[PDB]
Write a protein that binds this ligand. Structure first.
Ligand SMILES: Nc1nc2c(ncn2[C@@H]2O[C@H](COP(=O)(O)OP(=O)(O)OP(O)(O)=S)[C@@H](O)[C@H]2O)c(=O)[nH]1
Ligand SMILES: Nc1nc2c(ncn2[C@@H]2O[C@H](COP(=O)(O)OP(=O)(O)OP(O)(O)=S)[C@@H](O)[C@H]2O)c(=O)[nH]1
Ligand SMILES: Nc1nc2c(ncn2[C@@H]2O[C@H](COP(=O)(O)OP(=O)(O)OP(O)(O)=S)[C@@H](O)[C@H]2O)c(=O)[nH]1
Ligand SMILES: Nc1nc2c(ncn2[C@@H]2O[C@H](COP(=O)(O)OP(=O)(O)OP(O)(O)=S)[C@@H](O)[C@H]2O)c(=O)[nH]1
Ligand SMILES: Nc1nc2c(ncn2[C@@H]2O[C@H](COP(=O)(O)OP(=O)(O)OP(O)(O)=S)[C@@H](O)[C@H]2O)c(=O)[nH]1
Ligand SMILES: Nc1nc2c(ncn2[C@@H]2O[C@H](COP(=O)(O)OP(=O)(O)OP(O)(O)=S)[C@@H](O)[C@H]2O)c(=O)[nH]1
Ligand SMILES: Nc1nc2c(ncn2[C@@H]2O[C@H](COP(=O)(O)OP(=O)(O)OP(O)(O)=S)[C@@H](O)[C@H]2O)c(=O)[nH]1
Ligand SMILES: [Mg+2]
Ligand SMILES: [Mg+2]
Ligand SMILES: [Mg+2]
Ligand SMILES: [Mg+2]
Ligand SMILES: [Mg+2]
Ligand SMILES: [Mg+2]
Ligand SMILES: [Mg+2]
Lengths: 163, 163, 163, 163, 163, 163, 163
């Protein structure tokens, strides 16, 4: 009936694009997210309330204001960006150790799969150290926010962890 | 209705893998256990509370904090490691002489039986000097935490020593 | 109205098979009994609560936990196994000297009579030294748990020692 | 209701094996007894408290600490060891002259009768000079601690000298 | 639930950087620590209260004000600085002899491992004389405060010595 | 319930190593013992309080401060050091004639048996003139403090002389 | 718990430097000691109260005011000063004959060992006639107050003569 979500990731990942592809159905032009966007999207008789936030180094320290009462998390990672996959691992291993996100479900959108140099979801699952997760449910999906592929299959998995 | 367990052993044995094969049912990737893990698993209307600890030489001296109120012990030994079977014997003969574990039940998981060079449970029973045990109930089971074999047959024996 | 029973014996005897031939009516496939099974069976307006236990050498030392409040005992002996009839005699003469089983009724299921090499109930009565019993009522019945023969004639005798 | 016993003898006799055949029912592996073992065993509504001690030449001088308040003594002699039957005679004639064991009952376990070269209980009764005993009740029984033969027939005789 | 920590070391080690890498997650620019910094960081449902202090020769004499009620100590040593490893040994052997830190747990951050000329944790364990510690638990971890490596594995070990 | 011990010997013997192998279970690096170390170790429901002291010629004259109220003595002798076995004999024959140690139990740890040139416990028993002891109980055990062999068999013998 | 000490010696030896290396941990600049300095230093749960005095020829006659109630003495000798080793011998042989220092423990700090021309502790032990001491415990340690070497090993020996 209701669910709260927090979309996060590094800069350039695709968070805003994913959100406004789910909410509107169209690919909008984007500006860097200094503040935050919040939007409700309905699916399977469930109303997800997604909070997209900034990924710039200066806003990554303000994500803590949103950890509270968060039932799911969506970590978006740019697959073409193979040089920052270590920074994302640091961020995610730091945010998995926070106690406010202790029960949160973990979903990972490996975005930008339409690009030729994109890296597979298994290569990302290995590079991010996702099998090391033990206190938490987790899942990884390959997406293309510009085409909508894999986006409605993530909200479908998040439904498993309802209530 | 309840029971407390302490899983111990040398490094590389299989303690964490056993615990999260009982708790989750899947084989997780692992990191060395510097601290401790604690997990409750239900079976036969009994809720075992297992404490997995480190086996590095530096943490083997911190096991004493957990001996108290411990009703069962699970000593995991790597069978393929035939060069450290003497060190495990030292550790176990030292920990059998402690007075806090005076009534504790003893179970021995001879793990890594899937490997070709693995050593039989009787060869381990002879090398560990288990028949020398007289103040304590004891039992040895051959396992394969990656496949789950022999794991639910140890919790089954630990039930004999309930209450 | 009620009665408590303890089924015991060596390994391979037929305890589990007897129990789940009385309770279900079918011959189940079996695994070695590491722990214990407990089942209530009704007959002649009496509800027998049978506790089947392991016979492996390592579990024969845990039978003492069950001697208390036990009103009848059922010693199952494999008749085809003519090489272990001395070990069973040792076990039974040891367990007849325990003071918790001081008033318990003794029944002996000489099982596996369907086999050609099976030994008669009188040969077993002589080999087990059953006439030497003087502080206790006793009885010996020839059975075939696979066919149910002689099983309902043992519960019938146990009724004699009700209340 | 209660009784105190002191099991003694030379090294290699079978004291520890006898004790943990009476207490557990199984034949344990053994280490030389440097200190002492103490165990309570129930039989015929009597709780014997047996103290098994070392037989090495260096511990034979520490037996005096246990003579006090001792109501029965069990001298175990290896029958196969026909070369040390004189040393045992010396030890026993010395310990029969002590005034703390003035009323103690004497029992003699001629152990290791399963061996082919074993010597009869009458040959031992002659070699040990047991008929020379006049201030004391005495008895000699032929045993086999590995099989339990003759062990429960000694505790049965010790009951004669209760209270 | 709570724990008090004292981070100390020589000048240039990395104490402030470690503290504000644990607390904020970012590498801050630094000024010499004339006074003291104090910050609470949460991890594993535990709230560590860390006190970072100066290492200049003039402030090393004011550390005594903080020894009291200190449950853990974190000695940070610059590995690249191979010319001052003797001065750190002097400081640490002096501060191990103080009676206010009598029960304190010892952790050693061998920092600046990202530098090519860095010295291994075992070379430091030998140069600092850490095996000579006998009245105290101790542990040594290799770190890189600029990248966060090895920092959350020290707070994990400090949890072993809780309460 | 309690017992007081004094570990003594020449320099290089293994006293400190033995003590902190019993207390911690690990082989620590060592410095010459100028003062004294004191540690309590529990075993068999007994709490031995061991006082390890220096063996340098200058501290051998300060052992007298500890003779009082000493219930056991542990003389450690280096077996590889076959050139100082006469000096140890002098020291031990001098300290056996003191009246404060009149009732003390004597134990001798012939240490460093892992070395190839080590001398047997009987050769040491002959060289030290241990059979000449008549006013005192005594015992000699062969050890290897680095491996723990023979160490828990000495505390086991010291229990014989309790209270 | 408490102990009183008197540090003495010739001029230029290192008394003040030793005292304020023990008390503060730093090497202070110094002025000739016309009067006296007094400082308490804690170590091994003992609070030594050290009195450093002048060594000028005019103050060497005022040391008598401090001999009373003195439990230990620390004679500091400059090793580089090989021309005044006879004057120190005179002073020490005079102060050993005083009856107020009749039970005092003797410690000798052979300081300034960092200098190349320094003389060994055995050469000093021979030149000072220390083996001639018979009514007193004594000890000699080689130091370097500028580096702290050998200073905490003297207070460690002084603990032997506590109470
Ligand atoms: N070619 C391609 N571009 C994508 C894809 N997904 C997202 N993008 C594009 O990549 C750019 C970055 O996406 P954007 O949503 O603006 O970043 P962000 O996640 O919000 O992070 P920021 O707000 O801090 S800059 C955008 O131009 C967006 O259109 C994809 O699947 N393929
Ligand atoms: N091939 C094989 N590997 C096994 C088996 N059981 C456990 N392991 C593997 O052996 C490795 C060590 O197991 P692990 O559980 O991490 O050690 P530990 O007992 O926790 O000890 P540590 O935490 O101090 S490193 C792991 O890679 C694990 O997957 C087995 O039965 N077969
Ligand atoms: N041919 C034949 N097999 C029998 C008979 N009674 C029991 N068994 C068989 O003998 C085997 C052993 O019986 P089982 O009940 O499993 O042993 P147990 O008494 O439980 O002892 P355990 O659990 O310690 S292995 C089984 O395969 C069982 O089916 C019989 O009358 N005839
Ligand atoms: N073959 C055979 N061995 C026996 C018998 N009784 C005891 N033993 C064996 O003889 C050996 C010595 O028995 P043990 O109990 O250990 O000596 P002890 O009486 O305790 O004396 P010790 O402790 O000073 S070494 C053991 O290996 C034991 O198993 C027997 O009846 N037959
Ligand atoms: N290259 C590199 N620099 C590091 C590392 N860890 C810390 N530092 C850097 O070394 C410098 C000293 O660290 P800093 O934290 O300021 O010293 P301090 O421990 O606080 O001691 P002080 O305050 O008395 S000056 C800083 O410029 C810091 O950024 C590292 O792992 N690699
Ligand atoms: N190879 C070997 N070394 C041993 C053994 N037992 C003790 N040692 C080693 O011999 C050395 C001396 O032992 P140590 O305990 O320091 O002397 P001590 O008895 O305390 O006497 P001291 O303090 O006056 S120097 C140490 O390096 C120790 O590790 C052994 O069994 N084998
Ligand atoms: N190079 C070197 N100098 C030392 C050492 N120990 C002490 N000193 C130095 O020698 C000088 C004399 O030491 P000091 O403590 O002032 O003399 P004193 O013992 O107090 O005697 P006084 O007060 O009557 S002048 C000082 O400059 C001191 O720093 C050492 O180990 N090496
Ligand atoms: Mg955005
Ligand atoms: Mg682990
Ligand atoms: Mg069964
Ligand atoms: Mg024995
Ligand atoms: Mg700083
Ligand atoms: Mg020592
Ligand atoms: Mg001065």
């Amino acid at each position: 009936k209701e669910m709260r979500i927090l979309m996060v990731g590094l800069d350039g990942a695709g968070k805003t694009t994913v959100l406004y592809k789910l909410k509107l159905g169209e690919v909008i032009t984007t500006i860097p997210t200094i503040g935050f966007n919040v939007e409700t999207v309905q699916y399977k008789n469930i109303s997800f309330t997604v909070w997209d936030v900034g990924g710039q180094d200066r806003i990554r320290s303000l994500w803590r204001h949103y950890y509270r009462n968060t039932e799911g998390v969506i970590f978006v990672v740019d697959s073409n960006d193979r040089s920052r996959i270590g920074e994302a691992r640091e961020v995610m291993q730091r945010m998995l150790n926070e106690d406010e996100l202790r029960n949160a479900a973990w979903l990972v959108f490996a975005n930008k799969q339409d690009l030729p140099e994109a890296m597979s979801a298994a290569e990302i699952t290995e590079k991010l150290g996702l099998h090391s997760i033990r206190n938490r449910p987790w899942f990884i999906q390959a997406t293309c926010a510009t085409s909508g592929e894999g986006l409605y299959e993530g909200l479908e998995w998040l439904s498993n962890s309802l209530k």
